[PDB]
Design a protein around this ligand. Structure first.
Ligand SMILES: Nc1ncnc2c1ncn2[C@@H]1O[C@H](COP(=O)(O)OP(=O)(O)O)[C@@H](O)[C@H]1O
Ligand SMILES: Nc1ncnc2c1ncn2[C@@H]1O[C@H](COP(=O)(O)OP(=O)(O)O)[C@@H](O)[C@H]1O
Ligand SMILES: Nc1ncnc2c1ncn2[C@@H]1O[C@H](COP(=O)(O)OP(=O)(O)O)[C@@H](O)[C@H]1O
Ligand SMILES: Nc1ncnc2c1ncn2[C@@H]1O[C@H](COP(=O)(O)OP(=O)(O)O)[C@@H](O)[C@H]1O
Lengths: 391, 410, 386, 407
């Protein structure tokens, strides 16, 4: 839901020199620099027909590295994180599921035409009437409305109130000081899938599907039209498939097909299994991947976590959760994140916060941590004891 | 299903309720909303008797007379005399010449409209003698063998009952499962000398108010055609189902009357289709009507045969003439039509209308009624006077008069 | 486009009493009375399964009476005037032509919220501002140079109803209420308009049926919801005698529907053989349709009404005429068709401007009469040659 | 794109350069290759003013007159008056319903050939006054306001110049990016009484020889359609894009439909619908009959075959007949245009010949007469040559009379 909501790029820069903290990402310097090498490869365009596979134990940042890469490529580069088992659905076949995943990873920066009639409001003119607007070019009192002037009055008047098409009013500075009725290339990265959903006819659809092929054909023809025109600049995104070993041999061949296109996004995969059964076959292969795909694979190994790094990462997360906790509570959480998974530590954080509010406190103590640690268990403990009952 | 009938076609002669003949066979001056010509009416009665005797094997009726002499009225009277619900399908011969559909389709549709189907389905009806209609709603008492049975007929079903013109002291059944009301008549308790037993003054129901009564559903084959259509395949499917229903004993086929006016406008192929169809047993009557004499059969622009019908079919047709009417009968006719439509008209206006009908036609005189009463309404009067009729006659014209008006100058 | 855009009603006062000159109609009292009777019959809804056919020689206002009736039915009631020969077209079959003609007359009044920038102009402020006052408040509503130019085009400063970022309208100086009159304008869009919308040299270089079905479904949905309002209009078919038996049957079929608009036809032949078949009948119409027809006859025109009509037309075409010129034009319109007389006017205007005059004289009228031949003269002169 | 125009059809009216009427409105006896027909000439002027005023709202013009009275000539004069390069597409209705193709398609193409496009494009051309014409890599000196420029041309460009008959002191432009020399004219330095400013003696070019000239290409839609060989619609979209860009100004032409009495009623409806549109060109009819029966009705008879619907929207312009004097004048003008020297007595005999049969017959008699005169070694045509030619080739009326007479 809100994980990896702080990985804004790889934060190394300095000719591939990862900093300990940078922008949120702390630790795993080895894999960070390798990601930087791939990032330049995307810019230079020497990654065609190749993929990236991040091996490592669970909760070591493999997903965080992928999020940073998309942010580092661009502030608005599409990112698609799916699970290997997500393709085994009864609604859609493996083809449809994988096709949809590739689509949403294909971003289009349609430079939408917006006739931005902005201008520093000299006087808030009521209302369907007009509004005194002035810029560096001229003062052209412009057309307005009531629900709109209600928004303007509800906003900071007068603070510029940049008006785009009579929808938005930016109250920043007195800054709408260009041409009164000017033009803007509004960046809009609409995923190829997003175009598909618009065309598709169908608020309970998730409860009570599959995009029609003809719908796919039409938007593909449309995208070519805008691309030739010059409005749409196709931006190759990053597609991350967690639990890659879950995918079977038939799906793996499909990935080969989709990675040999000019629209193919950079494929990043993650798995924590060694030599296992290739799904859909009776052979054993490293990472559960067919050899054809493994040959052309940029494989980066995420090292396990160290003590201080776990503590630093927790510090970042609590700032997002608005939780103040004692240092002893910090260390116990770090110890929890060491013996058990880092995710389990994060889950404890929010639960412990309500513990603190239960006794009407502000800062969570060590007492609360043990209270929630005994309350909600970790997958290892639950499985451990629970098999003990069996025997 | 729905009653798919072009009511406007037969809307002009809804006052006719039958042929109106004596038991001996003769026709009285006026009976059952039929006045004027009688010899043709006796012939129509003879045709009805021939139908009931199953002697009308592959024969037809052709009504030869000038326009506005009751040809369609006589066909409707025949249909009524064969039964109240017997289908009637009035058509003109020029409607086969369609621009999108084939003449085969039009003739098949008009044949299908003319065959009835009595499907009897046992359904629980609220048969009872309406006592009160207190909307407290709307609770209504239903006198029966058990006695008055008060039930709340919802405002919607109460308005439908009003559409049945149902008042107190009336023995009717209200379909509860279907949520519909249909007038059976009044109660025999008030049966006067003109009101008899088991008629529009029906006796008190003998049984429970909610009785499973076989609802005789009068629906034509084309009435069932629109439902499934919502195609040849659809045609066949309904045919098999209806056949099976007939065999079971729940559907009784009732052939109707298919009236074809302006028979001279049909091609040779249409006549061949008509002959082929009427050769069959189920086929209904084909009552033709010709406004002219010998004419060249369309399609073969060299041969002229009586009434425009080919010889093969003419030799298998029974011909009935109609009289041109007289002012007194025409005035009586207008009186009946005005009573049906709800217009009060003065006697002098009736005489003027009758003479107008004698001059131009009965159709024009009948059609002039609505505009005249409506002009009087504009003037603020309820009764039509002579000047209103004169003004309407000078306002709207008849086809021949208008054509002459143009020719006068042309 | 244009033609007789001067009649906004039948002009028959009340109780079917034509008040001579009124909203255009300046004659044909009998025909006007009949048209009023037909109109109020339509209002009361007993014209179902009927039609009106207006007989009369050319140039007697047969189309004018139909336009007046269409206007009298409603200020936005659709009017569709086609010709009998208009259906035998190369692109469409008579079926498609008549279907389009019918759907052109079925209008849908659908509401549409709009923020008309309106206000009673108290001061004519010049791109710039413009003071506007309403019951809501008063303020100097800004307008463009062309918007104020149009404000001066309308009577100043009565009004004005300036639609949102659009033109204005003279009312009085008094449209009031809200400065944002968020009025759902009831746009009358004919079925054919929606059909064409769903479907610029297209005429130089027909809609399948799916678009038609979607249009019908959507319009029915809107009307049922209460957003749209299906208001049948009036369909006028001039030269009805040109129609054949097959199109007459389709007309008969279409008159059976509930959405069918009032059908008006015009003919000037009488006792003419039906285009299809080989049977003579009045006005070349099959009797099946003639039986249920309300016939209205337009009488020929007299001098004074012709002169009044010409006066109105010149008032429409911004032309000043000499009284002798008016009399000569009247005598011409009596000797020839009114249409030729109207044609004469525009040519006389340019002839007058050639000599740099302000009002056309009799000399210009005679010069243009000698210039352009009319129907009767051209034939006479041609046959004599042969 | 090659211009697709029936050069032979309009070749007979090449002497016509305009309507030849003064600013006041009345027409002179002879001007711009037009003699007589004053009434029809003034009518055509009025129609031209209406077209330029955009007051031809869904209207057309019907030219009624006997055969050989210049109906086609008047239509061509109107087209010329609206502009020298304004499209003109004559067509006789008898060829709408050809054995193959489709009436709709034939009328479609006829309409297309009547709609032009003024494609003004800025190309750097070599507009300069030829000072010298050295053909060696053809360094031709082009003196302009900048000066003489020895611009090296190619032998193909020199051949093109020779085809344009470009000589010394000839102000010509040589579009550099396409290597096409087009003779604009001579220099104003040699302008005399007849040679004037801005014509075949165009003045000295002001500016550099290599100047971005806004050259306008006159081309109608149909030429593009034939060049690109649905497909027709696609050409329309490209044209619309061109106009939208701001370099293609649409110019409606004139569609002249002769023998209108023999056109289907469906074709009449199609023409009505086409002229309904605003972009539509002016549709000018021409007929010789009287109240001839409509084509596809067989019982309705209407003036000139036109159905009453269209004919209610029509401005009839009558064309008169020519007396011996006008016939002789017109024959002499045509002979001059053909380069034919003819005696006055021969012209008189030709005029009386035309009076009996038609102006077409008299005009057609010229070429064979000139060839016969050439055979006998005479540079001019005498009355004897015209007599012999008349006795050799006949006219439809006379030959038909001969055939029937024997019958
Ligand atoms: N470099 C980093 N900086 C900050 N937090 C990190 C970093 N790497 C990992 N994390 C934390 O660890 C988690 C990474 O998720 P992870 O378990 O690697 O995904 P996967 O399911 O692929 O194993 C996140 O919740 C994130 O807060
Ligand atoms: N015998 C009759 N009895 C009652 N009404 C009649 C009779 N004959 C004709 N009419 C009236 O004439 C009209 C129908 O005309 P009709 O003559 O039946 O058709 P057609 O012209 O084909 O014979 C109806 O309005 C009907 O009221
Ligand atoms: N009642 C009327 N009042 C004013 N102008 C009229 C009237 N009737 C006809 N006109 C005008 O007279 C001219 C000729 O009449 P028109 O309607 O074209 O005749 P028709 O339809 O009978 O051929 C038209 O310009 C028309 O607008
Ligand atoms: N008014 C005119 N002025 C000059 N030449 C004319 C005129 N009218 C006709 N001509 C000449 O006579 C010719 C024959 O005319 P023609 O083609 O018969 O006209 P149409 O057939 O359209 O009436 C043309 O070749 C033309 O050069």
């Amino acid at each position: 839901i809100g994980a990896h909501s702080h990985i804004r790029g790889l934060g190394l820069d300095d000719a591939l020199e990862p900093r300990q903290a940078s922008q949120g990402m702390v630790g795993q310097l080895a894999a960070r620099r390798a990601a930087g090498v791939v990032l330049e490869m995307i810019r230079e365009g020497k990654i065609a027909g190749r993929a990236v596979l991040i091996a490592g134990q669970p909760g070591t940042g493999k997903t965080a590295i992928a999020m940073g890469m998309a942010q580092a490529l661009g502030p608005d580069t599409p990112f698609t994180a799916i699970a290997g088992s997500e393709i085994f659905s009864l609604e859609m076949s493996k083809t449809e599921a994988l096709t949809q995943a590739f689509r949403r990873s294909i971003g289009v920066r349609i430079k939408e035409e917006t006739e931005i009639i902005e201008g520093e409001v000299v006087e808030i003119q009521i209302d369907v009437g007009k509004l005194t607007l002035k810029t560096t070019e001229m003062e052209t009192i412009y057309d307005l409305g009531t629900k709109m002037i209600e928004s303007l009055t509800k906003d900071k008047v007068q603070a510029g109130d940049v008006i785009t098409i009579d929808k938005a009013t930016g109250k920043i500075s007195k800054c709408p000081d260009g041409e009164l009725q000017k033009r803007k290339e509004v960046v809009h990265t609409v995923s190829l899938h997003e175009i598909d959903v618009i065309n598709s006819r169908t608020f309970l659809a998730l409860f009570s599907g599959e995009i029609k092929s003809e719908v796919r054909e039409q938007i593909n023809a449309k995208v070519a039209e805008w691309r030739e025109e010059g409005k749409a600049e196709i931006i190759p995104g990053v597609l991350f498939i967690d639990e890659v070993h879950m995918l079977d041999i038939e799906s793996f061949s499909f990935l080969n097909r989709a990675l040999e296109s000019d629209m193919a996004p950079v494929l990043i995969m993650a798995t924590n299994r060694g030599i296992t059964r290739i799904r859909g076959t009776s052979y054993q292969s490293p990472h559960g991947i067919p050899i054809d795909l493994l040959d052309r694979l940029l494989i980066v190994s995420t090292t396990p976590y160290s003590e201080k790094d776990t503590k630093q990462i927790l510090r970042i997360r609590c700032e997002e959760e608005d939780v103040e906790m004692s240092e002893d509570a910090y260390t116990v959480l770090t110890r929890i994140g060491l013996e058990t998974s880092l995710r389990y530590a994060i889950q404890l954080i929010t639960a412990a916060s309500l513990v603190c509010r239960k006794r009407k406190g502000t800062e969570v103590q060590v007492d609360d941590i043990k209270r929630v640690y005994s309350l909600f268990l970790d997958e290892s403990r639950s499985t451990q004891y629970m098999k003990e009952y069996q025997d | 299903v729905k009653s798919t009938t072009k009511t406007q076609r037969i809307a002009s002669h809804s006052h006719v309720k039958g042929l109106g003949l004596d038991e001996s066979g003769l026709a009285k001056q006026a009976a059952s909303g039929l006045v004027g010509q009688e010899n043709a009416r006796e012939a129509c009665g003879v045709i009805v008797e021939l139908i009931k005797s199953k002697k009308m094997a592959g024969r037809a009726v052709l009504l030869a007379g000038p326009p506005g002499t009751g040809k369609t009225a006589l066909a409707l009277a025949i249909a009524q005399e064969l039964g109240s619900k017997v289908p009637f399908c009035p058509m003109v011969g020029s409607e086969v010449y369609s621009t999108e559909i084939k003449k085969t389709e039009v003739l098949m549709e008009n044949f299908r409209r003319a065959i009835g189907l009595r499907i009897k389905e046992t359904k629980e009806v609220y048969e009872g003698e309406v006592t009160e209609l207190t909307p407290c709603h709307v609770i209504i008492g239903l006198k029966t063998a058990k006695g008055t049975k008060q039930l709340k007929l919802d405002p919607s079903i109460f308005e439908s009952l009003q559409k049945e013109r149902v008042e107190a002291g009336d023995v009717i059944y209200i379909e509860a499962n279907s949520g519909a009301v249909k007038r059976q008549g009044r109660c025999d308790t008030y049966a006067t000398e003109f009101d008899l037993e088991a008629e529009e003054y029906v006796p008190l129901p003998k049984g429970d108010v909610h009785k499973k009564k076989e609802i005789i559903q009068d629906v034509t084959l084309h009435d069932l055609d629109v439902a499934n259509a919502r195609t040849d395949k659809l045609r066949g499917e309904i045919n098999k189902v209806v056949n099976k229903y007939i065999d079971q004993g729940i559907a009784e086929l009732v052939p109707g009357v298919l009236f074809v006016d302006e028979v001279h406008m049909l091609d040779i192929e249409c006549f061949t289709y008509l002959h082929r169809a009427l050769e069959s047993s189920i086929a209904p009557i084909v009552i033709f009507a010709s406004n002219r004499g010998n004419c060249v059969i369309r399609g073969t622009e060299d041969i002229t045969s009586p009434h425009g019908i080919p010889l093969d079919l003419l030799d298998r047709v029974m011909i009935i003439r109609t009289m041109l009417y007289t002012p007194q009968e025409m005035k009586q006719i207008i009186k009946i039509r005005a009573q049906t439509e709800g217009i009060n008209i003065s006697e002098e206006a009736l005489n003027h209308l009758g003479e107008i009908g004698t001059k131009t036609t009965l159709r024009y005189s009948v059609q002039l009624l609505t505009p005249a009463n409506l002009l009087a309404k504009i003037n603020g009067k309820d009764s039509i006077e002579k000047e209103h009729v004169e003004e309407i006659s000078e306002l709207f014209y008849d086809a021949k008069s208008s054509a002459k008006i143009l020719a006068d100058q042309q």
